[PDB]
Amino acid sequence: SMTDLLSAEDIKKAIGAFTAADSFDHKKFFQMVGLKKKSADDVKKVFHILDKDKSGFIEEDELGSILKGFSSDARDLSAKETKTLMAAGDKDGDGKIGVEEFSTLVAES
What are the recorded GO MF terms, alphabetically? Predict the structure, then answer.
């Protein structure tokens, strides 16, 4: 889980409070979820949870799957988010998010 690091409450509200909004851009959700509340290391703690067999990074395509890790209560990465959230979080512009970019996504939102 990611409650000891990331604000457990935030993730609960941010995830279940935005059905369509976050559906467009989770960036804002990134703020409400409380991912910024901590540092890249803290947020990364979940990255190890979700990025278990992603070889260090998840692909925008599969990103919509791994999404449920946190979003299991909300929706997943759709066309909009793949291009919006993945392409954003992965500011480096690699179409994917790895241990390196997962820190950048914190600076994004």
Answer: calcium ion binding; identical protein binding; protein-containing complex binding
